[PDB]
Each structure stands twice: as C-alpha cells, then as structure tokens.
Amino acid sequence: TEFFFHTMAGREGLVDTAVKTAETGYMQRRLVKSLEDLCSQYDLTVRSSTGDIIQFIYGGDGLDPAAMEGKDEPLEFKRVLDNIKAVFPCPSEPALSKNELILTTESIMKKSEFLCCQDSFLQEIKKFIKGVSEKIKKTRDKYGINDNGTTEPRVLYQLDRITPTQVEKFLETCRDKYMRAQMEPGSAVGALCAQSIGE
Amino acid sequence: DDEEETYRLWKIRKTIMQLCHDRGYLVTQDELDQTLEEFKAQSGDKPSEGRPRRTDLTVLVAHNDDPTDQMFVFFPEEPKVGIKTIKVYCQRMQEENITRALIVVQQGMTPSAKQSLVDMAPKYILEQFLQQELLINITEHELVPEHVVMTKEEVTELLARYKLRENQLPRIQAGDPVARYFGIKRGQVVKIIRPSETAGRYITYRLVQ
Amino acid sequence: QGRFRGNLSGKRVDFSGRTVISPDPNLRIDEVAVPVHVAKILTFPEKVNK
Amino acid sequence: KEDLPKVVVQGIPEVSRAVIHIDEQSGKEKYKLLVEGDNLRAVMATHGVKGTRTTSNNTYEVEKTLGIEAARTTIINEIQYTMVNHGMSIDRRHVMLLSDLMTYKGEVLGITRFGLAKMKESVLMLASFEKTADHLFDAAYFGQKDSVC
Amino acid sequence: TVAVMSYSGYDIEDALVLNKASLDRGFGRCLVYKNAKCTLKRYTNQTFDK
Amino acid sequence: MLLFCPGCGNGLIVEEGQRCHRFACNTCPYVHNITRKVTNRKYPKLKEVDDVLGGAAAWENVDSTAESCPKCEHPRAYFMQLQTRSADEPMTTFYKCCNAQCGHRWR
Amino acid sequence: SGSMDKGTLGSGSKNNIFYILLRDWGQNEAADAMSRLARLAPVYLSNRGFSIGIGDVTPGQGLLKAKYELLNAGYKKCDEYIEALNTGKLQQQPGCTAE
Amino acid sequence: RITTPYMTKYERARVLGTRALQIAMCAPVMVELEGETDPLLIAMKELKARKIPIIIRRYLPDGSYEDWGVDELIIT
Ligand SMILES: [Zn+2]
Numbered sequence: 006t007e008f009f010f011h012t013m014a015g016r017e018g019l020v021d022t023a024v025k026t027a028e029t030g031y032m033q034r035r036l037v038k039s040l041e042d043l044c045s046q047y048d049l050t051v052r053s054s055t056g057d058i059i060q061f062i063y064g065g066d067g068l069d070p071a072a073m074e075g076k077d078e079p080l081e082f083k084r085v086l087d088n089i090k091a092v093f094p095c096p097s098e099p100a101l102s103k104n105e106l107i108l109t110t111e112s113i114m115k116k117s118e119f120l121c122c123q124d125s126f127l128q129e130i131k132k133f134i135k136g137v138s139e140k141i142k143k144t145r146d147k148y149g150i151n152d153n154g155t156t157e158p159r160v161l162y163q164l165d166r167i168t169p170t171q172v173e174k175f176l177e178t179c180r181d182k183y184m185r186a187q188m189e190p191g192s193a194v195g196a197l198c199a200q201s202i203g204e
Numbered sequence: 205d206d207e208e209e210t211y212r213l214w215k216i217r218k219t220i221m222q223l224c225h226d227r228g229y230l231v232t233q234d235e236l237d238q239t240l241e242e243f244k245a246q247s248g249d250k251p252s253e254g255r256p257r258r259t260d261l262t263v264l265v266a267h268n269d270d271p272t273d274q275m276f277v278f279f280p281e282e283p284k285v286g287i288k289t290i291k292v293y294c295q296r297m298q299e300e301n302i303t304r305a306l307i308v309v310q311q312g313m314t315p316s317a318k319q320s321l322v323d324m325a326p327k328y329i330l331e332q333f334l335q336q337e338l339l340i341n342i343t344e345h346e347l348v349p350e351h352v353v354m355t356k357e358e359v360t361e362l363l364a365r366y367k368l369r370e371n372q373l374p375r376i377q378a379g380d381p382v383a384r385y386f387g388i389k390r391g392q393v394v395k396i397i398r399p400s401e402t403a404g405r406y407i408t409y410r411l412v413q
Numbered sequence: 414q415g416r417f418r419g420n421l422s423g424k425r426v427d428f429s430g431r432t433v434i435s436p437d438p439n440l441r442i443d444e445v446a447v448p449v450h451v452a453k454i455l456t457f458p459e460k461v462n463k
Numbered sequence: 464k465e466d467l468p469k470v471v472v473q474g475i476p477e478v479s480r481a482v483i484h485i486d487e488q489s490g491k492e493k494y495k496l497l498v499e500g501d502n503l504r505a506v507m508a509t510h511g512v513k514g515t516r517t518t519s520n521n522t523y524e525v526e527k528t529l530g531i532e533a534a535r536t537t538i539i540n541e542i543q544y545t546m547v548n549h550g551m552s553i554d555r556r557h558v559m560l561l562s563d564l565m566t567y568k569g570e571v572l573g574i575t576r577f578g579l580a581k582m583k584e585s586v587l588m589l590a591s592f593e594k595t596a597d598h599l600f601d602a603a604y605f606g607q608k609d610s611v612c
Numbered sequence: 613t614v615a616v617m618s619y620s621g622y623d624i625e626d627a628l629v630l631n632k633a634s635l636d637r638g639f640g641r642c643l644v645y646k647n648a649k650c651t652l653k654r655y656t657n658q659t660f661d662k
Numbered sequence: 663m664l665l666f667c668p669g670c671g672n673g674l675i676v677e678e679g680q681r682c683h684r685f686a687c688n689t690c691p692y693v694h695n696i697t698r699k700v701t702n703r704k705y706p707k708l709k710e711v712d713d714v715l716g717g718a719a720a721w722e723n724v725d726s727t728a729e730s731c732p733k734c735e736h737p738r739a740y741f742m743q744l745q746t747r748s749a750d751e752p753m754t755t756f757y758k759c760c761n762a763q764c765g766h767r768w769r
Numbered sequence: 770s771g772s773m774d775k776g777t778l779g780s781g782s783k784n785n786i787f788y789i790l791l792r793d794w795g796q797n798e799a800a801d802a803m804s805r806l807a808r809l810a811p812v813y814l815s816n817r818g819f820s821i822g823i824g825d826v827t828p829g830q831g832l833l834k835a836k837y838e839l840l841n842a843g844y845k846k847c848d849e850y851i852e853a854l855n856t857g858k859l860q861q862q863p864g865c866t867a868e
Numbered sequence: 869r870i871t872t873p874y875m876t877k878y879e880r881a882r883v884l885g886t887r888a889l890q891i892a893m894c895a896p897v898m899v900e901l902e903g904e905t906d907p908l909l910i911a912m913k914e915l916k917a918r919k920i921p922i923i924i925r926r927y928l929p930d931g932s933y934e935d936w937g938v939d940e941l942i943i944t
C-alpha cells in the first residue's frame with residue numbers, strides 16, 4: 006500500500022512537470038515575442054523599435070541586474086569596507102576619529118569625478134560613513150580612546166582602525182563599481198527580462 | 205439612516221475641497237480641515253440638508269490664475285440625472301457666466317445624459333463624478349503616486365532636455381480617475397513621482413491622449 | 414512548421430554537430446573538448462594574410 | 464419562491480465572500496478584511512474601511528479605479544509576491560520594465576495577441592506571432608508600409 | 613564488480629569510470645546487426661532488373 | 663407544497679373563484695376551496711460560522727518545534743516539504759521562523 | 770576559519786568566494802581559481818576515499834525504540850481524534866469544517 | 869561628451885570583430901605581432917595596446933551623434 010501511494014505521488018509529480026514544461030514554454034515564447042523590441046539607448050532611456058519611450062531610466066536608477074552585488078542593491082558597504090581594510094592595511098598611519106572621518110569624507114566627495122554620480126548613491130555613502138563614525142565614537146567612548154593619539158595601550162586603536170588612505174580606496178572602489186554596474190547602452194534588456202521571467 | 209448619509213456627505217465635501225485645492229482653486233484652511241462637528245452644525249439631519257441647493261458651491265475661483273474664473277459644483281438629489289436637470293444646470297451656468305462645472309451624481313448618469321454632456325459646448329466644460337468614487341480620495345492612496353501638472357515652460361524644457369516630441373512621451377487616457385481628478389485636457393503633461401524602495405524618488409512624465 | 418516559425422524565426426544551418434556529452438574536469442571552464450572526427454568535418458574559412 | 468430568498472438585502476452584490484484576517488504581531492494583533500470579490504470601489508466606499516490602504520489582485524479593477532500608475536504598482540507587487548511564494552527571487556528592474564511596457568499607452572495591455580497588436584505596429588512580427596493570414600490580408604488592404612526598425 | 617566511490621572526478625553527475633583491462637578482456641563487448649535489402653522486380657514490359 | 667388532483671393526477675394551481683381562493687386543475691373541473699390556513703415552511707439554512715480565524719494556537723498546527731534555522735536560530739519554527747518536481751533531483755524545503763516576530767520565508 | 774560548502778562554493782546565491790573573486794579581481798582570476806579547484810578536489814577525494822554502504826543507512830537500537838514510541842503515541846492520538854469526531858463533539862479549527 | 873566614458877562590451881566585441889576581419893584581409897599591423905596566426909588575438913593585442921584606428925560613432929535616438937576614439941575611451 007505504501008509503495009502504491011509512493012508511485013501515485015511520483016506519477017502525480019511527473020504529470021505535473023510534464024504540463025508545467027509545456028505551459029512555461031508557451032509563456033516564454035509569448036513573453037519573448039512581446040518583449041524582444043525593447044533596447045537600452047545611449048541617453049539612458051529605454052525606447053521601443055518605433056521610437057516611443059517605455060522608461061526614462063531603466064529601473065528608476067539605471068543599474069545592471071547582472072552586476073548587482075547585494076540584495077537588489079549595487080554594493081554592500083560593509084563587505085567593501087572590510088575588503089578595503091584587509092587588502093590595504095597601513096601600519097604607519099594613525100587612526101581617524103569621527104570628526105576627522107566626516108571631514109575627509111566631505112572633502113573627498115566634493116571632487117569633480119563624484120559630481121556625475123547619482124545623488125542617491127552619494128546619500129547612501131554619507132549614511133554609511135555617518136554610521137561607521139558613530140560606531141567608532143561609541144567604541145572610543147566605551148574604551149576611553151583619545152583622539153590625540155597619545156593613549157598608552159595602542160591595541161585599543163585596533164578595535165576600529167581607519168586611515169584616510171583606506172577611506173580614499175573605499176570611496177574610489179565604490180565609485181568605480183557604481184560606474185561599471187550601470188546599464189550599458191545597446192543591451193537587449195527586453196529579451197533578458199523575458200528570459201529571466203520565463204525561466 | 206441620518207447617520208451614514210451625513211457622514212458620506214461630509215466626506216464628499218472634504219474630498220471636493222481637497223480636489224479644488226489640488227487643482228489650484230481658492231479654498232481656506234477651514235474648508236479643507238472641516239471636522240464632522242462643523243458639518244453637523246451646518247446640518248445634522250438628512251431632510252434638513254439640501255442636496256440640490258444647500259450643497260452647491262460658487263466661491264471656487266482660481267486665485268493663482270485669474271479670480272474672474274469661476275467653477276461650480278452641483279449635487280443632484282435624484283439618483284439618475286436626466287436631460288432636464290442637465291439643461292437647468294446649463295442655463296444656470298449661462299445666467300451666472302460660469303464655464304467650469306462638476307456634477308456629483310448619486311447613483312449614475314443615463315446614456316443619453318452622458319452623450320449630451322459630452323457635446324454640451326466647447327466653452328461649457330462639465331465633469332461628471334460618482335459619489336462612490338468621491339467617498340475616497342485617490343491622491344491619499346498609497347498606491348497612487350504624486351502627480352503634478354506641468355506648465356508649458358516645463359514641458360518645453362522636458363522636450364528640449366531629451367530632444368523628444370509630444371507623441372513620444374508615455375500616454376495616459378483622459379478617462380483615467382486621476383486625470384478626471386485633476387481635470388487635465390489633451391496635450392497637457394503630468395510629472396509623476398514614484399516613491400522607490402530607497403530614500404530616492406523616480407521622476408516620470410505622461411502625456412494626456 | 415510554417416514559413417515564419419519553421420523557416421524564418423528558426424531554421425537549420427550547416428557547420429554544426431550534435432553529440433553526447435561526458436565529464437572532464439581537467440579542462441578549463443571556458444574550454445570544450447571536440448572529437449577529432451567532428452573536427453575534420455567542421456571547417457573554418459581563414460583568409461591568407463601576411 | 465424560486466428567487467425570493469436569493470435577493471440581496473445588505474452588502475455589495477459583486478462581493479461573494481469576506482473573511483476577517485488577523486495579524487498576530489508582537490506589538491499588536493490587527494484586523495483586516497479579505498474579500499473574494501471583484502469590486503474595489505465599493506469596498507473602499509463602505510463605512511469603516513480605510514480605503515487609502517486597500518489593494519486588490521485584479522489589475523483591471525485597480526486600473527479602472529485608481530489610475531494606471533496604481534495598476535502598474537499592483538502588477539509589480541503581485542508578480543513579486545507570486546515569485547517569492549516559490550522561494551525564487553527576481554530583480555525588481557525586470558518586473559518594473561514589464562509593468563512599464565504593459566502600462567505605457569495609458570491602458571493595461573496584455574501579452575496576448577490583442578495587446579501585442581495594440582502595442583506593436585510592425586506587420587511582419589504580428590504575422591509571425593499569431594493570425595498570419597488575417598494580419599497579412601489586413602495589411603494588404605490597408606496598404607500599411609512596415610519598416611525594418 | 614562495482615565499487616561505489618569517487619575516483620579522479622570523472623564521475624561527477626551520474627557518470628561512471630570503466631576499467632581498461634575489463635573492456636579489453638571482453639566486458640561490455642556488443643554486436644550490432646543491420647540489414648540491407650534490395651529488390652530486382654520485373655516491370656510491365658518484358659524487362660527485368662539485372 | 664405540490665398538490666395533485668385525485669381525479670386525473672395533474673398539478674393543482676391556486677386561483678380565485680367567486681367565493682374564495684381554491685386549488686384547481688387545468689385539465690378537469692375539479693376544484694377544492696380553502697377552509698383554514700395552509701402553510702409550507704422550508705426553513706432555509708442560517709449562517710452559523712462566525713468567520714473568525716488566524717489564532718496563533720490554531721496556526722501552530724505544525725510539527726516544527728525547537729529547531730535551528732540559519733536565519734535567527736529560534737526554537738519555534740514552521741517547516742514544509744515539497745516533492746512536486748522531477749527535474750529537481752533533491753527535494754524542496756520552506757522554513758519560517760516567527761518566534762520573535764521575524765517572519766522569515768526562504769527555500 | 771570555517772569549512773567550504775554549497776553556501777560558499779556552490780551556485781546558490783551571493784557571498785560565494787568565486788563571486789567575490791569575479792567582482793574584485795576580474796574574470797581571469799576567478800576562472801583560474803575554479804580550474805585549480807576542479808583539478809585539486811578530485812585528486813584529494815580519490816587519494817582519501819569516499820564511499821557509501823548499507824551500514825551508512827542502517828538504523829540504531831535507540832533510533833528504533835524512539836521510532837516505535839513515536840508511532841505508538843501518534844496512533845493513539847489519531848485514534849483519540851477519530852473517537853472524538855465520530856462519537857461526540859470535536860474542537861473545530863477556525864476557517865475549516867470538522868472533517 | 870554626455871554618454872558614459874566607459875567602453876561597453878558590445879562596442880568591444882564589434883571593434884574586435886571589425887579589426888579581425890580587416891587584419892584577415894591583409895591589413896597593416898601596428899603592434900608588431902610575434903607569432904600570432906589568429907587575427908582575433910592580434911585584434912585583442914591592438915585593443916590592449918590602444919592602437920586600433922577605429923572611431924566609434926555613437927548615435928543618439930533623436931538623430932545627434934558623437935565620435936569617440938578607442939584610445940580615448942576607458943577599457944576594462
Ligand atoms: Zn386534475
């Protein structure tokens with residue numbers, strides 16, 4: 006009886022998959038035939054074959070879904086900051102406080118290459134910098150770390166250690182990733198969307 | 205009755221005030237923020253309240269564009285508005301020299317009255333609204349984004365920035381609920397601000413066609 | 414099997430083969446092994462240059 | 464006797480079944496209405512119902528009641544929810560592009576042959592997809608020139 | 613004599629590794645017999661295929 | 663109710679004569695005057711369900727108790743197993759963990 | 770620290786080491802790392818030995834005892850529910866019938 | 869000057885294909901190849917050396933255009 010019930014369940018699954026394959030094949034055919042006309046232009050506006058604009062900007066922002074590192078987010082600031090701290094550890098430079106970190110972030114962000122970047126990404130960078138500065142401030146208040154750099158236990162500076170070189174590296178890496186993760190003009194976004202919905 | 209009917213009337217009046225404030229007409233803060241107690245003070249019973257006459261509004265004027273421009277609102281008492289009521293409203297607007305009118309029906313409009321209202325006159329613009337739709341404000345809905353009708357200068361700047369034409373912009377039907385709420389005509393452009401998942405906003409544009 | 418779906422959208426071509434697959438971990442991810450017999454059939458036109 | 468008990472005395476005729484759903488959040492257990500009907504305007508117009516936070520599954524009703532942008536948002540949310548129900552995730556940009564393509568002429572047009580004909584203009588693609596002879600003869604009658612765009 | 617184990621990574625997905633000496637000593641040897649038929653029929657006229 | 667004529671057996675309808683309402687057949691002159699009150703109740707079914715649902719005690723009708731999830735490792739959980747796909751050789755899991763109002767839903 | 774698995778080396782989702790290599794140092798480095806892994810793992814797996822037998826799926830004595838106790842308890846509770854529904858009144862869950 | 873300064877993968881593929889087709893037809897080489905019998909390898913070497921004499925003509929949808937050199941664009 007148990008073997009017969011298991012065979013019943015197996016045959017149910019088999020016929021379910023058999024119907025699902027055909028249904029999804031037809032749906033994918035329809036979706037691709039409908040969406041194959043769209044394409045990403047050079048002016049960041051997705052237009053159809055007749056010239057009508059479907060979107061003034063793809064996804065509202067213009068980022069490549071294939072180059073999405075985070076969960077529907079361009080970059081994971083925590084992982085990027087950890088990677089920057091690990092790859093470029095500067096032992097000959099002192100740590101930064103909250104005020105110094107905010108000052109150097111504001112001084113670096115106001116450069117020319119950061120002007121062409123989107124405002125939302127800059128606001129997210131500022132928010133992450135403020136958060137990490139608040140974390141460093143809380144750590145230094147818990148352990149009595151002085152911003153002058155004359156504390157006797159230097160190991161206390163190893164809890165949250167940040168140097169302006171690492172700040173510049175992190176900001177440049179984030180800017181480069183955000184620039185390279187944008188929608189490249191000429192890509193057939195409609196076909197990619199149809200396939201990523203049909204599969 | 206006498207409890208839900210007055211509440212519906214007060215909510216419809218508040219929705220009409222919000223619509224007039226969004227369209228740019230002159231409305232004081234008291235009319236916009238009108239509690240149920242003030243409406244009861246005006247009229248607390250259904251037979252005491254006058255739908256065809258006591259609820260009409262004539263002070264609606266476009267203070268931003270021209271105070272001479274006047275807009276009127278009618279509240280027919282009968283469930284289905286006929287040809288005679290439309291003709292009476294039209295002759296009243298002719299006497300009072302009013303070109304823009306809204307008609308808040310109770311249940312619906314007969315097809316003949318609809319067809320007549322469609323081709324009343326190019327100068328006499330009249331918009332029909334069902335009370336069932338006006339019982340809830342479309343703008344305050346979470347799914348409906350913020351819509352702002354752009355002036356001709358903003359439309360020209362938009363067409364110049366992207367080097368586009370009018371017919372290349374996304375279309376929106378005149379029969380759209382938001383379109384009738386704002387009373388936009390063919391050729392006007394509306395900027396829509398969609399709230400994204402992050403702190404940013406997505407700016408799009410639609411042409412009425 | 415019409416003209417649009419069978420002869421315009423999807424059509425058969427030459428210089429192609431079909432064979433069963435087998436695993437081989439000693440090759441790179443961007444490399445694929447081709448049999449000698451099929452390699453002698455599928456030809457590539459190379460232009461004579463300097 | 465055949466139809467007297469089947470007359471409606473209170474409620475919306477389009478509404479067939481409404482149930483009281485409850486959310487047991489640790490902060491507070493709140494109550495909402497799940498309506499198995501096809502009339503959103505009537506539900507929003509009823510007393511005691513917060514119409515500002517009322518959604519629906521039927522895209523046509525949302526389009527007809529709250530505009531085309533509300534219909535687009537409903538389509539996006541429903542597709543994302545249906546995809547998450549199966550444990551698989553899709554980037555929101557794809558469903559946003561799909562909803563924008565379905566809602567760029569002011570009316571929600573399907574992926575079926577009718578919506579595909581109403582959106583596209585190319586004769587060759589319409590003939591290749593479905594209704595080959597009908598579309599070809601209609602184009603021959605209209606004399607519509609088809610570009611290669 | 614099958615041994616259930618992983619070897620050389622050439623049996624990743626459902627594949628199997630065979631022994632060369634086993635195949636050389638007759639294991640798995642198979643025979644394929646095909647038929648080729650021809651007909652020499654006489655037509656209406658007094659002539660035959662030769 | 664449904665009444666029939668004793669004479670021919672056809673269905674009787676209710677009409678008004680010269681003195682009182684009466685049952686009568688359309689194929690015979692048989693009639694029957696109404697003397698006292700006649701009634702035919704049906705007793706339609708009433709709505710007995712209160713339509714209240716969603717209780718946490720009733721929702722926690724599942725086996726999953728005191729397990730470990732890779733999201734918040736809370737004891738109380740909610741597991742579901744699916745085998746309805748032959749292309750996927752392994753099975754399919756769906757775990758939810760709402761002990762501290764987390765509300766996870768993964769594969 | 771840690772041990773490699775599908776969550777780190779598989780094709781499940783993000784946080785893959787190969788994905789990090791692809792996003793940080795280009796495609797060539799990730800391809801070379803994958804090739805080195807595909808050339809290293811089989812050699813060690815063959816030199817160490819990995820096999821499954823009938824003894825790897827056999828149940829223990831305590832497992833059999835626990836299974837027997839659980840089956841008995843479940844059958845008793847199911848019989849109690851059957852007796853409660855058939856003879857008497859059974860607590861009906863909300864949103865559904867008694868059956 | 870308003871488009872992205874980075875050179876996309878489609879432009880890369882098309883430029884490499886055109887350069888390989890040209891070199892296959894006895895085109896002059898500007899990188900002094902060392903035993904490369906494959907035209908695509910020579911095209912990739914020229915791209916890495918930034919010596920491809922090809923100027924991309926990016927067309928805007930309205931009708932405007934703009935010229936960008938391979939050496940001017942940014943490669944990855
Ligand atoms: Zn009778």
Ligand SMILES: [Zn+2]
Nearest residue numbers: 734735736759
């Ligand atoms: Zn947990």
